Write a protein that binds this ligand. Structure first.
Ligand SMILES: Cc1cn[nH]c1-c1ccncc1
Ligand SMILES: [Cl-]
Ligand SMILES: [Cl-]
Length: 163
């Protein structure tokens, strides 16, 4: 575990993270995809061997000894708000199981279902709160990665609010 487990936020490419493992915002079919998933494919392509997994699940594949945790959030274009919310919560619970199993002291994590799976809605708060629900009981240092300047401020404020 980390000596004083923390949450932090950085605005940069998650493919340049400084953590012991990464969470991919994966598609269910293990395809290169776009956004976070395409950056992860360019950086760790070996991790896409048998990475296909259903919505609401996470599957880890090693690139050398570096763990890539493929987490499949729901596409809110296809799911109801209610069913999508349940699957988004579930994907983050499976990420917490994998992080714990791997014994890492730190993890780089994007906000699941906030980009092309958002169904055109702002889901910063919904996605971040499910991340916290899952990860609060883990003792890894969590570093959240984003690309928007206004999102960085709002994520930083939400972390600071809990102190
Ligand atoms: C969060 C986000 C949205 N569009 N692209 C990204 C991104 C891309 C690569 N690495 C990390 C994040
Ligand atoms: Cl997304
Ligand atoms: Cl962002």
């Amino acid at each position: 575990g980390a000596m004083a487990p923390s949450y932090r936020v950085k605005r940069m490419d998650i493919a340049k993270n400084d953590e012991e493992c990464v969470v991919n915002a994966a598609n269910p079919r293990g395809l290169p995809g776009d956004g976070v998933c395409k950056a992860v494919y360019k950086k760790w392509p070996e991790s896409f061997k048998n990475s296909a997994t259903p919505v609401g699940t996470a599957k880890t594949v090693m690139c050398g000894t570096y763990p890539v945790i493929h987490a499949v959030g729901p596409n809110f274009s296809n799911y109801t708000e209610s069913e999508g919310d349940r699957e988004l919560a579930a994907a983050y619970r499976e990420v917490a199981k994998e992080v714990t199993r791997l014994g890492v002291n730190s993890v780089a994590i994007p906000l699941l279902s906030t980009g092309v799976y958002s169904g055109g809605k702002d889901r910063l708060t919904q996605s971040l709160n499910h991340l916290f629900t899952a990860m609060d009981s883990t003792d890894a240092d969590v570093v959240i990665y984003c690309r928007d300047k206004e999102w960085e401020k709002k994520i930083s404020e939400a972390i600071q609010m809990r102190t």
